A = this chain, B = another copy of it.
Amino acid sequence: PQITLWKRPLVTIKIGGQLKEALLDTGADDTVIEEMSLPGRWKPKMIGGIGGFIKVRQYDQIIIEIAGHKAIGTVLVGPTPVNIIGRNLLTQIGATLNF
């Protein structure tokens, strides 16, 4: 699709069999989603945005569908205010910015 930015670019994602809403975010290096249960081991990561830092759990090689496009990659789980799809997965679904 071609998505304009007059509204938030929200899409549905599917992860862990569940549907969630998430923001397509070119300003985010990584994908960050709210508290949920994921399989496997996790590693620590401390990620910074506006306001300061949060601690998150990093899960690698997680299967996730984004607007119907399959991706497999790193998902950070933590107390984010919104689910964010960052560049690590936007690149897997072939997203570009165009003007």
Contact = CB atoms under 8 A, between A and B. Distances in A.
Interface of A: 1-6, 8-9, 23-29, 32, 47-54, 67, 69, 80-82, 84, 87, 90-91, 93-99
B91 A5 contact: yes
5 contacts: A23-B26, A24-B27, A25-B25, A50-B50, A51-B53
Contacts of A49: 49-51, 81
Given A5-B90, A69-B99, 12 more contacts: A1-B98, A3-B98, A6-B91, A24-B26, A26-B27, A48-B81, A49-B51, A49-B81, A50-B80, A51-B54, A90-B99, A97-B98
A96 B95 contact: no
